[PDB]
């Protein structure tokens, strides 16, 4: 239900948006969140859902809050409070000064030099999967590509067996879009239960994989601890298993529904990177937040120490104050403004990997299957959370229109 309204919150600021089951979900997730930017809604609102918390609804406030880590701490970055309290991943649960030293280590395993080394295998995997689907004239895109394409690459990078994917994917999903079977704390402890023996093993006998690299790594010139390594490796798993996996499906749902936009990319494939950026804006999908370190008056609103504030990364690029006609996809948009990969000191460090995976998927798919549609009669369902997603995406095409390459 709705948590009782705290005394310090004026009733005129109440807007009971449920980030885990938003009212207008049937219209699309981004559409469902964009209700927070309707004409009657203030820049900063209180929702009584999910224990009660603030929501910044506009790009300007979201950006300002991500910059001000002194007032807006990452210590408790998830809603609901019990999830944010249990959340201890590194670097995300940390503020400067201590946070930054951990970013360099994470960059060693998923940063640009690593992405370069993996790029041929990434390309190869996309081609392999797509060629196998091509003659079928149909797929369940979420499970036939959106999942295995990013996840098998992450498993390879981390040196984990592919048979472990269903278990790990289940756990990650419970931390971002819980189905009610597990609390965040339970899913976290299970993920750590998995990692503990692996980290011990790889500190004793290091390999070349990501976990070995992190577990035996150094931070600001001193050895990382087993526990710090566990808390970082957990985060890396969530990133590899539950980000681009969802994003690809939003993109592909859009392309199937939009023949005019596909054709643009078939006629002019060099536009694909710009298209990637515009889609990252339009189908932005992350929303986490921060906790107030002290009482603070922010844009005329009295925020109280300990208050949680959702700062939906998703909303910045959908904000008409940041981009004209924001629900329209324009691959030639001149200034594509978004905070899809975050803002401030916690900027996504997986973004080279993410962009490569998106760009590769678009290029390799459109080359082989230029003409495809949503299965006739299908209604695409979505699920909202910390990272939002597509429940299923049945696609169809005429094999005669495809090219084996
Ligand atoms: C479309 C794909 C992705 C999106 C939209 C995305 C989004 C984000 C966002 C919004 C943040 C900031 C969180 C915050 O400020 O609290 C973040 C941080 C982070 N992301 Fe990504 N991400 C994506 C892919 C990836 C991938 C593939 C990885 C690979 C491991 C990854 C690893 C990380 C890490 C390690 C951080 C923490 C940085 C820090 O706290 O200093 N992300 N990401
Ligand atoms: C918000 C994120 C996308 C970012 C990387 C994975 C994620 C769910 C986190 O816990 C930090
Ligand atoms: K915490």
UniProtKB/Swiss-Prot annotation:
Keyword Cytoplasm: yes
InterPro entries: Cyt_P450, Cyt_P450_B, Cyt_P450_CS, Cyt_P450_sf
Keyword field contains RNA-binding: no
Cofactor(s) this protein cannot do without: heme
Pathway: Terpene metabolism; (R)-camphor degradation
GO biological process: (+)-camphor catabolic process
Its EC number(s): 1.14.15.1
Subcellular location: Cytoplasm
One GO cellular component term noted in the UniProt record for this chain: cytoplasm
Entry binding sites for heme: 348
Catalytic activity of the protein: 2 reduced [2Fe-2S]-[putidaredoxin] + (1R,4R)-camphor + O2 + 2 H(+) = (1R,4R,5R)-5-hydroxycamphor + 2 oxidized [2Fe-2S]-[putidaredoxin] + H2O
Gene Ontology molecular function: camphor 5-monooxygenase activity; heme binding; iron ion binding
Keywords: Cytoplasm, Heme, Iron, Metal-binding, Monooxygenase, Oxidoreductase
Physiological role: Involved in a camphor oxidation system.
Family membership: Belongs to the cytochrome P450 family.
Family annotation (PANTHER family): P450, PUTATIVE (EUROFUNG)-RELATED
Protein name as annotated: Camphor 5-monooxygenase
